[PDB]
Structure formats: C-alpha cells, structure tokens
UniProtKB/Swiss-Prot annotation, chain A:
SIII, also known as elongin, is a general transcription elongation factor that increases the RNA polymerase II transcription elongation past template-encoded arresting sites. Subunit A is transcriptionally active and its transcription activity is strongly enhanced by binding to the dimeric complex of the SIII regulatory subunits B and C (elongin BC complex). Core component of multiple cullin-2 and cullin-5-RING E3 ubiquitin-protein ligase complexes (ECS complexes), which mediate the ubiquitination of target proteins. By binding to BC-box motifs it seems to link target recruitment subunits, like VHL and members of the SOCS box family, to Cullin/RBX1 modules that activate E2 ubiquitination enzymes. Component the von Hippel-Lindau ubiquitination complex CBC(VHL). GO terms for molecular function: transcription corepressor binding; ubiquitin protein ligase binding. It is found in: Nucleus. GO terms for biological process: positive regulation of proteasomal ubiquitin-dependent protein catabolic process; protein ubiquitination; protein-containing complex assembly; target-directed miRNA degradation; transcription elongation by RNA polymerase II; transcription initiation at RNA polymerase II promoter. Keywords: Acetylation, Host-virus interaction, Nucleus, Phosphoprotein, Transcription, Transcription regulation, Ubl conjugation pathway.
Curated annotation (Swiss-Prot), chain B:
It comes from the Eukaryota. It is found in: Cytoplasm; Nucleus. This is Protein fem-1 homolog B. Substrate-recognition component of a Cul2-RING (CRL2) E3 ubiquitin-protein ligase complex of the DesCEND (destruction via C-end degrons) pathway, which recognizes a C-degron located at the extreme C terminus of target proteins, leading to their ubiquitination and degradation. The C-degron recognized by the DesCEND pathway is usually a motif of less than ten residues and can be present in full-length proteins, truncated proteins or proteolytically cleaved forms. Component of a CRL2 E3 ubiquitin-protein ligase complex, also named ECS (Elongin BC-CUL2/5-SOCS-box protein) complex, composed of CUL2, Elongin BC (ELOB and ELOC), RBX1 and substrate-specific adapter FEM1B. Homooligomer. Interacts with PPM1F and PHTF1. Interacts with the death domain of FAS/TNFRSF6 and TNFRSF1A. Interacts with CHEK1. Interacts with NKX3-1. Belongs to the fem-1 family. The chain holds residues 472 to 627 of 627 of the full protein. Coiled coil: none annotated. ANK repeats lie at residues 12-56, 60-97. Widely expressed. Highly expressed in testis. Weakly expressed in other tissues.
Swiss-Prot record, chain D:
SUPFAM superfamilies: POZ domain (SSF54695). Overexpressed in prostate cancer cell line PC-3 and breast cancer cell line SK-BR-3. PANTHER family: ELONGIN-C. It is found in: Nucleus. Belongs to the SKP1 family. Its main location: nucleus. GO terms for biological process: protein ubiquitination; regulation of transcription by RNA polymerase II; target-directed miRNA degradation; transcription initiation at RNA polymerase II promoter; ubiquitin-dependent protein catabolic process. Heterotrimer of an A (ELOA, ELOA2 or ELOA3P), ELOB and ELOC subunit. The elongin BC complex interacts with EPOP; leading to recruit the elongin BC complex to Polycomb group (PcG) target genes, thereby restricting excessive activity of the PRC2/EED-EZH2 complex. (Microbial infection) Interacts with HIV-1 Vif; forming an active cullin-5-RING E3 ubiquitin-protein ligase complex (ECS complex). Disulfide bonds: none annotated. This is Elongin-C. It comes from the Eukaryota. SIII, also known as elongin, is a general transcription elongation factor that increases the RNA polymerase II transcription elongation past template-encoded arresting sites. Subunit A is transcriptionally active and its transcription activity is strongly enhanced by binding to the dimeric complex of the SIII regulatory subunits B and C (elongin BC complex). It comes from Homo sapiens (Human).
UniProtKB/Swiss-Prot annotation, chain F:
It comes from the Eukaryota. The Cullin neddylation domain restrains the RING domain of RBX1 in the E3 ubiquitin-protein ligase complex; this restraint is removed upon neddylation of the cullin. Neddylated; which enhances the ubiquitination activity of ECS (Elongin BC-CUL2/5-SOCS-box protein) E3 ubiquitin-protein ligase complexes. Neddylation leads to structural rearrangment in the complex that allows interaction between the E2 ubiquitin-conjugating enzyme and the acceptor ubiquitin. CBC(VHL) complex formation seems to promote neddylation. Deneddylated via its interaction with the COP9 signalosome (CSN) complex. It comes from Homo sapiens. Transmembrane segments: none annotated. Component of multiple Cul2-RING (CRL2) E3 ubiquitin-protein ligase complexes consisting of CUL2, Elongin BC (ELOB and ELOC), RBX1 and a variable substrate-specific adapter; this complex is also known as ECS (Elongin BC-CUL2/5-SOCS-box protein) complex and may consist of CUL2 or CUL5. Component of a ECS(VHL) or CBC(VHL) complex containing CUL2, RBX1, ELOB, ELOC and VHL. Component of the ECS(MED8) complex with the probable substrate recognition component MED8. (Microbial infection) Interacts with human respiratory syncytial virus (HRSV) protein NS1. This is Cullin-2. It is found in: Nucleus. The chain holds residues 491 to 575 of 745 of the full protein. Belongs to the cullin family.
Length: 96, 156, 84, 96, 81, 85
C-alpha cells in the first residue's frame, strides 16, 4: 500500500499502488487514465530516472516513506523523453 | 416534546438531556433508587427520539457526549454506556466539539472503555480536522469565514 | 464423544462449586454468624430449584471460602461460622 | 473510475471516483446535467479554490478511503498553519 | 466457493473478560454484592484496574489486597490505575 | 445482504452470505486449543466486508471466528466441476 502523486505540468494524478509491483502496469494505468500512447511515459523520482524493472516500493519510496497524508512527488515526462517541467502549487497567503 | 421545546436549564446550564446523561443527577433516597438510576440509556433514547437538542451545551460548555464519557463506571453498566453513546452519535452530536476549556471528549474520556467506544463511533471529517487545526493554531477567523462556519470554529 | 461428555460433567462440576461459593456468601452476608450444621440445611434449601448439592461439596466450598478470607470459624466454637 | 478536479489556478487533479465521492458537493457536481459520462475524466472546474487546497483535499480523500474504519492507531493529518483557514472553507464548500 | 456459511462469536471489546477472584464476568455483580441483593452497594461495583492490565471487581480487589499485595495471576505487586 | 448493495462501489464478493452471529456469553460452544486456521483467500474478502459492516452497526464488538463449526460449498475446478460438494 504505497501512495503516489504523479505530476506533469498542471496535471496531478493520485494513485494507490502495492508494496511489490513493477511500474509497467503503473504506466499502463496512467495510459488508461491519460488517453495518450503508453510509450511516452517516463517517471522521475526527484530529478532521477527510475528503473522500469524495479518495483516502485524498492525504487526508493516505501509505505512508511510515502504516507497517504503526503505521498511521493514522482514526476511524469512524455517523449519528445522531454524534460520535467512540473508546475508547483501556489503558495498559501501569509498569515498576519 | 412540549417540554423540550422550551429548553429547561438548571443552575449549571444543564439541559434536560444532560441530566439524563449525567451520573451526578441527584436521585431521591426512597424507592426511586431502585428504578430510576442515572445515567439511563432508555431516557436518552426517548429524549433524542422526541427531538432533544443533542448539541446543546451547559455553562461549562460540556456537551452530552462530554458528560457521558466522564462516566466512572464504564463496565458495571457497559450496556447502558454503549447504548447511550450510540444514541448520542446517531442523533448528530459532534464527537469533536470542545468545551470552554478546549478539551476533546476523547481528551476528557478519562477511561479506556469510553475512549475505545467513542473512537469506534467517531466519524471523522475534513471540516472537523481543519477547524481543530485552526483553533490550535489560533488564527484570526472572524470576518474571514462564513458566519455559519464561525459557529463551527466556535465549538471545534 | 464420551470423553467430551465427562468434560461437560467436569465443566458443570466447576459451575456447581462456584454457585455453592456464592450460595455460602449469600447466607453468611445476611447473618454474619450461623451454626455449621444449620448452614448446610440452608444452602440445600436455596438450591432445591437447582443442582442438588452433595454434602462433600459444601465441605470443600466452605474450606475454599475459609482461605479466601471471607468466612471463618468463630473463636468461641468451631461449629460457629462468621463473615471475615 | 477516475475523476478530474481543476483548481482555479489552472492546476488539475485526478483521483479515483470512489475517493471523490466522500464529499457531498462533488457527488452533486458529478451527478446532474453535464455528468460527462465518458467514465474517464468527469472534469469539474472549481472556479474559486486555489491549487494547494485542492491538493490537500485530494490527500484527505485518499486518507479517508484508506482509514475509513481500520488501523485504530489513526495517523494525524498534517495541516499546515498557512493552509488552514482556507482548507476549512474548501471543506465546507465540498461538505466533506 | 460458490457459497459459504460461518459462525461469529461476538463479545464486547473490553480487554478483560473475567474477574479471576470470584470467577465471574465483570458485567454482572460481584459475589460481595450478589449476596445482599440490590440494597445500596450493588450500584457501585467499580471495576478497578491494575498496572499489569489486571481488572477485577472493587470488592474482589479490596479483599485480595486485604490478604496480600500480589496480583492473583502473576507474582506482581498490586497497584491501582 | 443489502449493505453490499448499498455500498458506494459495487463489491461482488462472489459468495452468498449467510453467516450466523451468536453471543459468546450464552452459547457453550468455544475453542480451547489454538487451531489458528488461516482464512481462505477466495473468501477472505468476505470477512473483511463483514467486519466493515459489523463494526459500524455494532460498535465495540470483536468477532472471533470458530472455523470448526464453519462449512461451505466446494469448488471442484480441478475436477471439471461435476455437480456440487
Ligand atoms: Zn470478582
Ligand atoms: Zn496482575
């Protein structure tokens, strides 16, 4: 039960995944919910390309690491693989 | 129903629901000890079924739930406590409101049994967590929120 | 299975002792002092609608309540019982 | 199966439909005319709430789906002081 | 399996199940208060807890500590909670 | 039976539900040894759905599962499924 927050420009996807599972079906489900060809997806973990064969739980973020309160910020990139340009959320107004 | 819709109150702001909820309600020493023992889950179920204002608070700010979790006999009449807590939660009483001293009923549970029961019956919501965090952070909420939500900040 | 049949008899053999222990306490609380033999007739009187108590059952149960510091023989005579 | 939430500041959020049905107002928004029964996006345009509060309510939706009644050692929800007093309005508007 | 049946033994979520002094359940009266019927002391029966997760009747704990300050289950010094 | 129908998501457990619920205080039946039988995985989603239902309707009530009195219907998929057992 690992939690992800897939980001790409202004688009953010929240998805729950298991502890030991490869990103192949993760790419297929983001294909199914993004209506784009599956060959373009290339997710980044903190400006770092991740191994497709490696399961996401063993890719660096675990169940304890990716709490559902604030999941991992694994980015998303598409084939020109383009450089990640994820737009951060607007900062809250400062309290007086 | 007629008696509730006048909202009687005692000296310490106790609504008519609270006295049935409270264990400190005086009982006459004669045979009324045998029959009418307070708290009584039947009385609370009847009063909530007759339209008692379950969110009513006393002068000290304790709700019905705050008084019932302070019951010092959680197991001798555990059926009574369980039935009254079920009735109070099902009526619509907040399991998260705060008294005048800003204490959660879980924080005022003073009993493992009542804490377990109320956590089993707590129905958490984002509004409750947000309001509790606003109150704990002491942010100026007046004139920045809906007026109906000003009450929500008031008791959460 | 007849092996489990004896277990059911042994299980209620535990239950009959516990009821006798509560039976001794009930009479002793209302009196705080009674004759040893008169209590045996009294516990039988309160157990007619339930398990018929053999005389040896009261013997051990009274002995059990002695070491639980709830009943004790009176200093005046061993035939006189007293709440403690 | 997947629903789309758009913040006022252009940001999009995609989460499971079951996750977003825990709020009554979003359930009403999905229902009614303009349900957009393509079963993949069901996009809703929040014209008021900023991006960060929408991210927080998506996190809350996943948080409540995961811990609706289980794991009695319930984790605390990390409300930032700056995002408070604005997430309360969002929760009220969504009737979460 | 197309269809399946089962039995579920439900009991209250209290961690303690029996008072190992009178060998009775905690829901009903203790043997001290079962003797004099209702009267006036039946209403109290406060379930005293212990530091070793030991919960018994107030009367049972009172008479036990009158005998000795040892937990009835383990050789542990009794304390209230 | 209607609770699974009233769920927000269609949860087809695939097993007809007829599970009895019986008070532990009254019934003399119990389990003395461990007998720690693991739930079969084809119906392990049924009990979790039942624990979800029982907790909210009946708060503060644990449910130990006495499997020695528990019986179901056999899926003979390896036999080609003739008749039923
Ligand atoms: Zn006892
Ligand atoms: Zn102990």
């Amino acid at each position: 039960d690992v939690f992800l927050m897939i980001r790409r420009h202004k688009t953010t996807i929240f998805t729950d995944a298991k502890e030991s599972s490869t990103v192949f079906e993760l790419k297929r489900i983001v294909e199914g919910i993004l209506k784009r060809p599956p060959d373009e997806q290339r997710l980044y973990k903190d400006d770092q390309l991740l191994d497709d064969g490696k399961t996401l739980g063993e890719c660096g973020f675990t169940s304890q690491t990716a709490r559902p309160q604030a999941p991992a910020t694994v980015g998303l990139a598409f084939r020109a693989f383009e450089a990640l340009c994820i737009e951060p959320f607007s900062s809250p107004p400062e309290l007086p | 129903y007629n008696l509730i819709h006048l909202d009687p109150r005692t000296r310490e702001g106790f609504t008519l629901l609270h006295l049935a909820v409270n264990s400190n309600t005086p009982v006459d020493d004669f045979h009324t000890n045998d029959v009418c023992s307070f708290p009584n889950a039947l009385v609370t179920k009847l009063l909530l079924d007759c339209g008692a204002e379950v969110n009513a608070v006393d002068n000290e700010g304790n709700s019905a739930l705050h008084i019932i979790v302070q019951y010092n006999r959680p197991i001798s009449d555990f059926l009574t406590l369980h039935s009254i807590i079920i009735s109070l939660v099902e009526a619509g009483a907040h399991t998260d409101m705060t008294n005048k001293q800003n204490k959660t009923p879980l924080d005022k549970s003073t009993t493992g049994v009542s804490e377990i029961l109320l956590k089993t019956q707590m129905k958490m919501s984002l509004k409750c967590l947000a309001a509790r965090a606003v109150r704990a952070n002491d942010i100026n909420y007046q004139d920045q929120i809906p007026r109906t939500l000003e009450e929500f900040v008031g008791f959460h | 299975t007849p092996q489990e049949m004896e277990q059911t008899r042994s299980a209620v053999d535990e239950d009959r002792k516990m009821y006798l222990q509560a039976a001794i306490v009930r009479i002793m609380k209302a009196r705080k002092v009674l004759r040893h033999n008169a209590l045996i007739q009294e516990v039988i009187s309160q157990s007619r609608a339930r398990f018929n108590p053999s005389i040896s059952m009261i013997k051990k149960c009274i002995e059990v309540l002695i070491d639980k510091q709830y009943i004790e023989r009176s200093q005046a005579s061993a035939d006189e019982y007293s709440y403690v | 199966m997947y629903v789309k939430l758009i913040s006022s500041d252009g940001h999009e959020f995609i989460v499971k439909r079951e996750h977003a049905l825990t709020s009554g107002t979003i359930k009403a928004m999905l229902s009614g005319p303009g349900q957009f029964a393509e079963n993949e996006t069901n996009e809703v345009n929040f014209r008021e709430i900023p991006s960060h509060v929408l991210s927080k309510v998506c996190m809350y939706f996943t948080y409540k789906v995961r811990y609706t009644n289980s794991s009695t050692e319930i984790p605390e929800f990390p409300i930032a002081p700056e995002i408070a007093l604005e997430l309360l309005m969002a929760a009220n508007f969504l009737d979460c | 399996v197309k269809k399946w049946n089962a039995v579920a033994l439900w009991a209250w979520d209290i961690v303690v199940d029996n008072c190992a002094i009178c060998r009775n359940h905690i829901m009903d009266l203790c043997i001290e208060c079962q003797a004099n019927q209702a009267s006036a002391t039946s209403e109290e029966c406060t379930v005293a807890w212990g530091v070793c997760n030991h919960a018994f009747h107030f009367h049972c704990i009172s008479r036990w500590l009158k005998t000795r300050q040892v937990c009835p289950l383990d050789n542990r010094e009794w304390e209230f909670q | 039976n209607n609770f699974i129908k009233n769920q927000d998501t269609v949860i087809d457990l695939g097993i007809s539900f007829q599970i009895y619920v019986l008070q532990a205080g009254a019934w003399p039946l119990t389990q003395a040894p461990s007998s720690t039988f693991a739930i079969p995985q084809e119906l392990e989603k049924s009990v979790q759905m039942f624990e979800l239902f029982y907790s909210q309707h009946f708060s503060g009530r644990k449910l130990t599962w006495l499997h020695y009195l528990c019986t179901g219907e056999v899926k003979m998929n390896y036999l080609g499924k003739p008749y039923v057992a």
